[PDB]
């Protein structure tokens, strides 16, 4: 029943909501590491460990 | 009496055991259908990543 441009609209709205929620989750993870240990160890494949 | 005994009938004592409704109080929706089967969909949206 969904048109194929409508499916594109659905997946685009879903991805934008997912980016918003992932940035808020990164804020939560940094706040938790700041509260417990006093040192956050930011890592990643595209980011050297500091 | 002579040929037999006289009787009086009182009220017919009756008992009607029912199994009343307990578990159907959580099943409110009623669906009638002439199709074969009833299909569902289930979607998990894993937001909680960093």
């Amino acid at each position: 029943t969904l048109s194929i441009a409508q499916r594109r609209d659905r997946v685009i709205a879903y991805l934008l909501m997912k980016h918003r929620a992932m940035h808020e989750n990164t804020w939560e993870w940094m706040a938790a590491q700041a509260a417990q240990y006093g040192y956050v160890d930011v890592q990643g494949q595209d980011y050297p460990l500091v | 009496a002579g040929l037999y005994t006289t009787y009086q009938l009182l009220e017919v004592q009756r008992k009607l055991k029912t199994l009343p409704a307990f578990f159907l109080q959580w099943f409110p929706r009623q669906i009638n259908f002439q199709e074969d089967m009833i299909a569902f969909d289930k979607v998990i949206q894993d937001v909680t990543r960093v």
Side-chain angles (χ1 to χ4, degrees), chain B residues 8-27:
Chain B
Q8 284 193 358
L9 291 173
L10 299 181
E11 294 181 354
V12 175
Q13 293 177 355
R14 290 177 178 175
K15 183 177 180 180
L16 177 63
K17 297 179 184 178
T18 57
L19 189 146
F22 178 70
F23 288 98
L24 285 173
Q25 72 185 357
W26 293 287
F27 288 179

Side-chain angles (χ1 to χ4, degrees), chain A residues 14 18 21-22 25-26 29, chain B residues 44-50:
Chain A
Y14 178 70
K18 192 176 183 183
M22 280 188 177
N25 293 322
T26 305
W29 179 70
Chain B
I44 301 170
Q45 291 179 357
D46 292 330
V47 159
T48 68
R49 296 192 68 186
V50 174

Side-chain angles (χ1 to χ4, degrees), chain B residues 31-45:
Chain B
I31 286 176
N32 301 319
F33 67 102
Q34 294 180 357
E35 310 295 326
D36 286 328
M37 299 178 76
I38 294 174
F40 286 102
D41 292 330
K42 60 182 182 181
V43 170
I44 301 170
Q45 291 179 357

